[PDB]
Design a binder for this molecule. Structure first.
Ligand SMILES: COc1cc(CNC(=O)CCCCCCCNc2c3c(nc4cc(Cl)ccc24)C[C@H]2C[C@H](C)C[C@@H]3C2)ccc1O
Ligand SMILES: COc1cc(CNC(=O)CCCCCCCNc2c3c(nc4cc(Cl)ccc24)C[C@H]2C[C@H](C)C[C@@H]3C2)ccc1O
Ligand SMILES: CC(=O)N[C@@H]1[C@@H](O)[C@H](O)[C@@H](CO)O[C@H]1O
Ligand SMILES: CC(=O)N[C@@H]1[C@@H](O)[C@H](O)[C@@H](CO)O[C@H]1O
Ligand SMILES: CC(=O)N[C@@H]1[C@@H](O)[C@H](O)[C@@H](CO)O[C@H]1O
Ligand SMILES: CC(=O)N[C@@H]1[C@@H](O)[C@H](O)[C@@H](CO)O[C@H]1O
Ligand SMILES: *[C@@H]1O[C@H](CO)[C@@H](O)[C@H](O)[C@H]1NC(C)=O
Ligand SMILES: [Cl-]
Ligand SMILES: [Cl-]
Ligand SMILES: [Cl-]
Lengths: 532, 532
């Protein structure tokens, strides 16, 4: 009864799940699209045909086909991000957590996982929706979308492999929520989309895309924004990378039709095995198959859209972590190790700069080096390590997001900006990595509320504050409860540019997040590269 | 007897002058060249024809023809730099102070006044050599040389106005010292040349020029070096500026001989009246007529000479003042005033940057602006003022000198580097100007030893320390008296790059003088300009 819901696509039967000494309802693995298999590989998604009978929605679906990390086999800190279910191209499903008893018409939050557009799953332990749904009495949805070449192979001109189909998967799931969430006790007029990393970039891309704007109310972006250097490519570069994928698999490169037909004959893992080979440079924080600026999903360049105010005008809440860069340095740059302090020699520093900014000429690499080198002390392995960490995080995450936040605030209806700088007491990664890319998510999803997970009492309190900010924002457009006597998170404005730290300490308001470095990344360096 | 000296050019009668509580011998206004007047204007100097009878050397000579500063009429802070004797093209004379009784063969120090190559006089109060000669028992010489167009009009190819004749004036005075100083009790084998501003540049130029190297033993350079951006021009630019001077004065421009013939008919003040109009830019710290890189005084470019070690290898002592820039900003940049704290608006900051780096393109100016702007606080008028002050000092004096010091020390025989950062207690210029271009000179010449000048006891001690460093370096190639127990001024080395502060506090040793900004000015910005 409470677990039996009739949707426009057919009936579903959910499951009663325990959560912090209570219970809520979960509907796991609801299909929202036709399986993008066989002749539908690389194609825009199609709506799921209605089914007869009762869909058993008591277990998580399959995860999409993706590269799996084996750098640290069995290590919890990496394995928590890997698919925990069987991989299949039959992967377009969503999950819903509903408070018990069912609300009449409550605020909806829709989670979009990150993972560089090449990886990610709705089913990770860290994305478990039950704590946030129960604690804040929201209807929490997690969608899925095709990643890698399956979601973002782009042969512009072709209707068979147009690009951005992973973004259209997200949209089709949002359309399903719009059509069906009322039957689960959600208000389709009060849907907040939120996501981290490529999920954060995606949230911003739906803000930008006209075809998406009317499918959600407001938006939260975590450590990602649509203008990130890794988050899109031109149609030309998307074409080049698709052809290089064919060449890597002895495909007929004569035409789009022959190349696509060849690529459709391959087992998914044959694509995944060569996926990294199509990148133009040795690089870190760069991903092969990402959204294309196509003229359809994106009418024009992102910069012209941002400048013109051509985007959904609403409220946004967004922010970054203190050490976004460290994970990518561990996995891809010389001298870093998870088992040492990773003091970086000057030689390794210069090597990391070139990997971190692979599109730069030598004059640009000199500019970056000078900006992040203390020439009184250039052989200090700690300053070299932290300098490189800052380079990666500033260029790839923080300054793109600050450029977005400043353009958006000129036209939007309310901006709230945060700086997450809490290092978790039980982190398994070494100290030098700081506050890592991805590690605010466990706080957003309420994991510190689980006593078995061994967070401190102050971390539980921080998680509860963060969940309440996010949910109050979703409900109202403001993370603050006015008439309350808690410290107030101020609006980010064009003039004062305020933001807060998120950590276990009493609130601090600051201004101009990393302004010095972001002037370099957002204004000076692009001018240097456009001149030379 | 003591005051009557027979030189190789004729007899000279000096005068007995009081110094503190004693006396010494002064030989003032001794001619070392034929008057460069009439058809000899712009020509290389020729040796002074010997005279019969006794030259009356009891009186300071005339000053060379030069622009006179009237910004602050009657103000001691500016008038102390203006000619204090009648100006005349008949101005190639030198002054000698001899200890009494006359020494056998003692250390010689030859002062070369600065003034941007457009101004300066051997006869200013602040250059009175009696205190140094008496206190340190050296023979102190001050020379003169033609400034402005009279010294540095350059029509390369012409033997009538070849350029660099002011530098040749200085050389001929050095040749005179070489030939005659033994008759005044000086050792011509132990001559130290020293100078400030254009005098410091000149000293470095005599180190570089083969025709100069055998006329002195070692060198001191104060707030100027031969590679400074204001200190020389190419033959094409000197020619351009010489033609433009003619155009300003309705001269025949058809040939070198016609132009020179025209310019030799003008009264000296007619040339001076338009001197500044030939500069290629609105600028500050740029001067119209300066040494040319001609292939004769300078065999090749200054950089290639420094790179290959094509220069005199000896000991050098050299340094800079904390606030080299402030004087030039006061005189030529918007927002500055001697009667206010001169807080600088952002608009005036950007104006000053363009005046300070006149040769830069827009990308270059953006680079300088970013390097010196605190973007957490860009509307702070104090920071804007101090930023502009650092830009001028770093670009024009400090970083060029650090480039010279690093290149020279690769081949030289001993380098001693100082940073003068004492603000005089009796300064008449306002506080914002700090430690001003030129204001270490009074300490080098022992003016704090005169009680009537109102220096503190500590400033007298500092002057005595500096005089002793300068004189002991001149005698031995090392400013320290070994076997003594004062703190030791260490050799600047390529590896450790040590320098000392010069102030009233006990001596501190530092390393890598303004290394962060001079990487910018010496390596990154010139690479940017050369690519753009
Ligand atoms: C020559 O150029 C180079 C090219 C390469 C090509 N890379 C490879 O072959 C291995 C890929 C490893 C990905 C491992 C992904 C592990 N998921 C992690 C994720 C996040 N936080 C992590 C934080 C840590 Cl601490 C460890 C793993 C993390 C936050 C997310 C956001 C993500 C982007 C993924 C994901 C979800 C490598 C080095 C180079 O130099
Ligand atoms: C917009 O810019 C422009 C501005 C103008 C108008 N200004 C001019 O023509 C020059 C006036 C300066 C002469 C003032 C000479 C006063 N001597 C001074 C000297 C020195 N220390 C000083 C320190 C102070 Cl505190 C004041 C005067 C000083 C140390 C020396 C080294 C020197 C270079 C000169 C000299 C000896 C013209 C064209 C422009 O483009
Ligand atoms: C309606 C129905 O057959 N439901 C079953 C459920 O009993 C079982 O626990 C689980 C198996 O994975 O889901 C399925
Ligand atoms: C002639 C002599 O020995 N010294 C003279 C001095 O008497 C005179 O006052 C001065 C001014 O011309 O010139 C010198
Ligand atoms: C500081 C310096 O370079 N001193 C050198 C010394 O090392 C060398 O022995 C000598 C003879 O070449 O000349 C001097
Ligand atoms: C050169 C100078 O300024 N000297 C002054 C003097 O004029 C003044 O009468 C006295 C007052 O204490 O201090 C000293
Ligand atoms: C949001 O829009 C409403 C409606 O016009 C307006 O009253 C309000 O001031 C806006 N808020 C912000 C922060 O711009
Ligand atoms: Cl639980
Ligand atoms: Cl006296
Ligand atoms: Cl050395």
């Amino acid at each position: 009864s409470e677990l039996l819901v009739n949707t426009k696509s057919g009936k579903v039967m959910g499951t009663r799940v325990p959560v912090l000494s209570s219970h809520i309802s979960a509907f796991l693995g609801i299909p929202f699209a036709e399986p993008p298999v066989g002749n539908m590989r690389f194609r825009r998604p199609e709506p799921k045909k209605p089914w007869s009978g009762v869909w058993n929605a008591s277990t998580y679906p399959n995860n999409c086909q993706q590269y799996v990390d084996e750098q640290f086999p069995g290590f919890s800190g990496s394995e928590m991000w890997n698919p925990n279910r069987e991989m299949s191209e039959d992967c377009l499903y969503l999950n819903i957590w509903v408070p018990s008893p069912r609300p009449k018409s409550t605020t909806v939050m829709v989670w979009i996982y990150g993972g560089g557009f090449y990886s990610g799953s709705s089913t990770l332990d860290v994305y478990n929706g039950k704590y946030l749904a129960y604690t804040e009495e929201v209807v929490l949805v997690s969608l899925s979308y095709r990643v890698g070449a399956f979601g973002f192979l782009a042969l512009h001109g072709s209707q068979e492999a147009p690009g951005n189909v992973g973004l259209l998967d997200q949209r089709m799931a949002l359309q399903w929520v719009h059509d069906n969430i009322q039957f689960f006790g959600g208000d389709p007029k009060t849907v907040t989309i939120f996501g981290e990393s490529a999920g954060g970039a995606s949230v911003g891309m739906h803000i930008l895309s006209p075809g998406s704007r009317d499918l959600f109310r407001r938006a939260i972006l975590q450590s990602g924004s649509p203008n990130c250097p890794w988050a899109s490519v031109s149609v030309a570069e998307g074409r080049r990378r698709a052809v290089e994928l064919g060449r890597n698999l002895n495909c007929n490169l004569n035409s789009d039709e022959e190349l696509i037909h060849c690529l459709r004959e391959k087992k998914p893992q044959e694509l995944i095995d060569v996926e990294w080979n199509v990148l133009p440079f040795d690089s870190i924080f760069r991903f092969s198959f990402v959204p294309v600026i196509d003229g359809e999903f994106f009418p024009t360049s992102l910069e012209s859209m941002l400048n013109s105010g051509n985007f959904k005008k609403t409220q946004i809440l967004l922010g970054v972590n203190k050490d976004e860069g460290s994970f990518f340095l561990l996995y891809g740059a010389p001298g870093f190790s998870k088992d040492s302090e990773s003091k970086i020699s000057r030689e390794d520093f210069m090597s990391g700069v070139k990997l971190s900014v692979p599109h730069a000429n030598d004059l640009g690499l000199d500019a970056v080096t000078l900006q992040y080198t203390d020439w009184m002390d250039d052989n200090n392995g700690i300053k070299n390590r932290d300098g490189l960490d800052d380079i990666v995080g500033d260029h790839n995450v923080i300054c793109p997001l600050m450029h977005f936040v400043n353009k958006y605030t000129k036209f939007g209806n309310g901006t709230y900006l945060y700086f997450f700088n809490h290092r978790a007491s039980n982190l398994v990664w070494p100290e030098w990595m700081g506050v890592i890319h991805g590690y605010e998510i466990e706080f957003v999803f309420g994991l510190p509320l689980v006593k078995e997970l061994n967070y401190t009492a102050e971390e539980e309190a921080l998680s509860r504050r963060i969940m309440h900010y996010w949910a109050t924002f979703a409900k109202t457009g403001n993370p603050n409860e006015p008439h309350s006597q808690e410290s107030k998170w101020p609006l980010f404005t064009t003039k004062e540019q305020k933001f807060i730290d998120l950590n276990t300490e009493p609130m601090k308001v600051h201004q101009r997040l990393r302004v010095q470095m972001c002037v370099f990344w957002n204004q000076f360096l692009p001018k240097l590269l456009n001149a030379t």
